[PDB]
Structure 1
Amino acid sequence: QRYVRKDGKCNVHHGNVKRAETLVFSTHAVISMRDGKLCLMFRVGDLRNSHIVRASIRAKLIKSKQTSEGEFIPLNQTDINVGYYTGDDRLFLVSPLIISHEINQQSPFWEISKAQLPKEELEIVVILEGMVEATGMTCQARSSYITSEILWGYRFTPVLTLEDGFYEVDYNSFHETYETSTPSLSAKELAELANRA
Structure 2
Amino acid sequence: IQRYVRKDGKRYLTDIFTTLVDLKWFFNLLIFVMVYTVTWLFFGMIWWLIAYIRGDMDHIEDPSWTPCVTNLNGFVSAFLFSIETETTIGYGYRVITDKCPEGIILLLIQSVLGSIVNAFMVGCMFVKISQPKKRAETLVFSTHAVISMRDGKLCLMFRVGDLRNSHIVEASIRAKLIKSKQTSEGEFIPLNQTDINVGYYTGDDRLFLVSPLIISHEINQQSPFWEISKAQLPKEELEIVVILEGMVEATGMTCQARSSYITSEILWGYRFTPVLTLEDGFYEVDYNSFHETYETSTPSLSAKELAELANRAES
TM-score range, shorter chain: 0.7 to 0.9
Moved more, 143-152 or 53-62: 53-62
Q: 1:21 to 1:178 in 2, by over 3 A?
A: farther
Moved more, 137-146 or 71-80: 71-80
Aligned partner of 2:287 in structure 1 is 171
Count of aligned pairs between the two proteins:
186
- The Cα shift of 1:91 comes to 0.7
Distance 2:136 2:277 in 1: 21
TM-score, normalised by the number of residues in structure 1: 0.86
CA deviations over 1:9-53 (Å, ceiling 9, x no partner): xxxxxxxxxx99666200000001000111111000036235224
CA deviations over 1:81-132 (Å, ceiling 9, x no partner): 1111112111111210000011110011111110100010111100111112
Asked if structure 1 preserves the Cα contact closer than 8 Å seen for 2:146 and 2:266, the reply is yes
Aligned partner of 1:2 in structure 2 is 3
Unaligned runs of 5+ in 2: 9-134
- The Cα shift of 1:165 comes to 3.5
Match of 1:130 among 224, 246, 250: 246
Aligned partner of 1:25 in structure 2 is 141
- List 4+ stretches of structure 1 deviating above 4 A: 1-7, 19-23
Larger relative helix fraction = 2
Distance 2:6 2:196 in 1: 34
RMSD after superposition: 2.3
- The Cα shift of 1:63 comes to 0.6
- Please give the secondary structure, in 2, of the residue aligned with 1:22: coil
Asked if structure 2 preserves the Cα contact closer than 8 Å seen for 1:3 and 1:167, the reply is no
Distance 2:186 2:262 in 1: 25
Asked if structure 1 preserves the Cα contact closer than 8 Å seen for 2:246 and 2:256, the reply is yes
CA deviations over 1:137-192 (Å, ceiling 9, x no partner): 11110001111110000100001022464432111111011110110000001111
- The Cα shift of 1:72 comes to 2.1
Distance 2:306 2:155 in 1: 12
Q: 1:162 to 1:50 in 2, by over 3 A?
A: closer
Larger relative strand fraction = 1
Once the two structures are aligned, what percentage of the paired residues are identical?
Answer: 99
Asked if structure 2 preserves the Cα contact closer than 8 Å seen for 1:80 and 1:101, the reply is yes
Distance 1:118 1:44 in 2: 24
- Please give the secondary structure, in 2, of the residue aligned with 1:191: helix
Distance 1:146 1:136 in 2: 34
Matches within 5 A, 1:1-197: 24-46=140-162, 48-163=164-279, 165-197=281-313
Q: 1:22 to 1:116 in 2, by over 3 A?
A: farther
Asked if structure 2 preserves the Cα contact closer than 8 Å seen for 1:20 and 1:48, the reply is no
Q: 1:131 to 1:162 in 2, by over 3 A?
A: same
Distance 1:103 1:182 in 2: 14
Distance 1:4 1:31 in 2: 35
Asked if structure 2 preserves the Cα contact closer than 8 Å seen for 1:30 and 1:41, the reply is yes
Q: 1:136 to 1:50 in 2, by over 3 A?
A: farther
Distance 2:205 2:167 in 1: 17
Moved more, 65-74 or 38-47: 65-74
Distance 1:78 1:22 in 2: 27
Aligned partner of 1:10 in structure 2 is none
Bigger RCO (CA 8 Å, 6+ sep): 1
Moved more, 175-184 or 59-68: 59-68
Unaligned runs of 5+ in 1: 8-18
Distance 2:253 2:4 in 1: 26
Q: 1:83 to 1:172 in 2, by over 3 A?
A: same
TM-score, normalised by the number of residues in structure 2: 0.55
